[PDB]
């Protein structure tokens, strides 16, 4: 359970984006909108797991800039295949976050 305990005791939050046109823009957005957070990316080809410690924000304005075309926040659902963290979403941004620190 050493391996298991260590897997459980993480504070990684953030989107899992399915393969498509949102992968690179979401990665770039995570980096830009969370300065002073390290962004981790695990590439599984069909999807990419993107994470930061404790909290990761994606703003509509930044995502639109990185994607390069008009974008409404609700459209992210087309490519948001899963996520780590609790979610708080509105017209301006999505926030992935934890209440506890493990």
């Amino acid at each position: 359970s050493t391996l298991a305990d260590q897997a459980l005791h993480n504070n990684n939050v953030g989107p899992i984006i399915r393969a498509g046109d949102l992968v690179e823009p979401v990665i770039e957005t995570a980096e830009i909108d969370n300065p002073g957070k390290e962004i981790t990316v695990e590439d599984r080809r069909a999807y990419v797991r993107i994470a930061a410690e404790g909290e990761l924000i994606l703003t509509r304005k930044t995502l639109e800039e990185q994607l390069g075309r008009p974008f409404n926040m609700q459209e992210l659902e087309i490519n948001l295949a899963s996520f780590a963290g609790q979610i708080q979403a509105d017209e301006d941004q999505i926030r992935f976050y934890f209440d506890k620190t493990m």
């Binding site: 770039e28 800039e65 990185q66 390069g68 075309r69 008009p70």
Partner: protein, 305 residues
């Protein structure tokens, strides 16, 4: 020798942008290679007929700027996003047509309104086609692809308006078959006094071949006149005659018309970076306004009759 260079994140011409290039930047910018060689726009004999045409009507325009290519559609529309937007607006208009026809809207218009439509509305297909033709001309002559793209979409919007008018002319004729709807529009365009100012204006405008003058006359003079002197008064008349469909239709067309004005004004702002251009633009406006004013006066006199 050459230098060894690494891949660029975007086109070489955009590579110096601070921002990540947008869809619009990638597919719209600096596509007219015909502006590269001043002596030979096109890859033919330097004095071939079309090369002579472009050297005179584009390159030699008094409207001058050292970087027309830097122009940006403020809406940054591309083919893909234009179709999304217009499928939205057009679906909406077609839905209005369906629903108002179901409710037999045309049967409930004020007595005699069918005759006002036959005389003042249905022949708009000629005016709108002239705008279509003229828009296509600015397209083919403009010195930047970003400018031409705005003109392509505007040419399409002009055909959209024509098509609205054709459909409603026919539909109205179903309820009012004895008003000459769909039958007498060419005669009216050619012979009716209220149409003659507009027709004279457009025949002359279509023969202003300098790209700069074509643009100013079309987009800064003719088209704004149509908005204030045709589109809006028709809405007022329709209201007075219990036509509730026409104002909604025209509101959708006005959305297109305001978009054309937005990009036009943005081109002007770009042009005005060169102080010489103010006198040039103002000169062309002063030149055409009399014709446009007479066109509107005649049309309004007819509408009010």
């Amino acid at each position: 020798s050459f230098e060894s260079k690494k891949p660029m994140r975007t086109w070489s011409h955009l590579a110096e942008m601070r921002k990540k290039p947008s869809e619009y930047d990638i597919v719209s910018r600096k596509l007219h290679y015909s502006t590269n060689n001043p002596d030979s726009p096109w890859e033919l004999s330097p004095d071939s007929p079309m090369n002579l045409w472009y050297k005179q009507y584009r390159n030699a325009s008094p409207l001058k700027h050292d970087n027309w290519d830097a122009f940006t559609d403020p809406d940054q529309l591309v083919y893909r996003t234009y179709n999304l937007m217009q499928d939205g607006q057009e679906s909406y208009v077609q839905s209005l047509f369906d629903q108002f026809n179901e409710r037999e809207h045309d049967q409930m218009v004020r007595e005699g309104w069918e005759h006002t439509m036959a005389r003042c509305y249905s022949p708009l297909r000629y005016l709108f086609h002239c705008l279509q033709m003229s828009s296509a001309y600015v397209q083919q002559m403009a010195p930047a692809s970003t400018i031409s793209n705005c003109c392509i979409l505007q040419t399409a919007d002009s055909l959209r308006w024509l098509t609205h008018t054709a459909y409603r002319t026919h539909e109205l004729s179903l309820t009012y078959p004895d008003a000459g709807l769909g039958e007498h529009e060419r005669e009216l365009w050619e012979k009716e006094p209220g149409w003659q100012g507009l027709r004279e204006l457009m025949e002359k405008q279509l023969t202003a071949f300098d790209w700069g003058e074509a643009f100013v006359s079309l987009n800064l003079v003719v088209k704004p006149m149509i908005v204030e002197s045709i589109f809006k008064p028709l809405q007022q008349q329709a209201w007075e005659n219990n036509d509730t469909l026409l104002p909604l239709l025209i509101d959708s067309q006005l959305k297109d018309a305001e978009r054309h004005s937005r990009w036009s004004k943005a081109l002007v702002k770009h042009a005005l970076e060169n102080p010489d251009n103010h006198a040039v633009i103002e000169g062309w406006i002063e030149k055409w306004r009399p014709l446009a004013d007479r066109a509107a006066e005649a049309y309004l006199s007819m509408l009010s009759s």
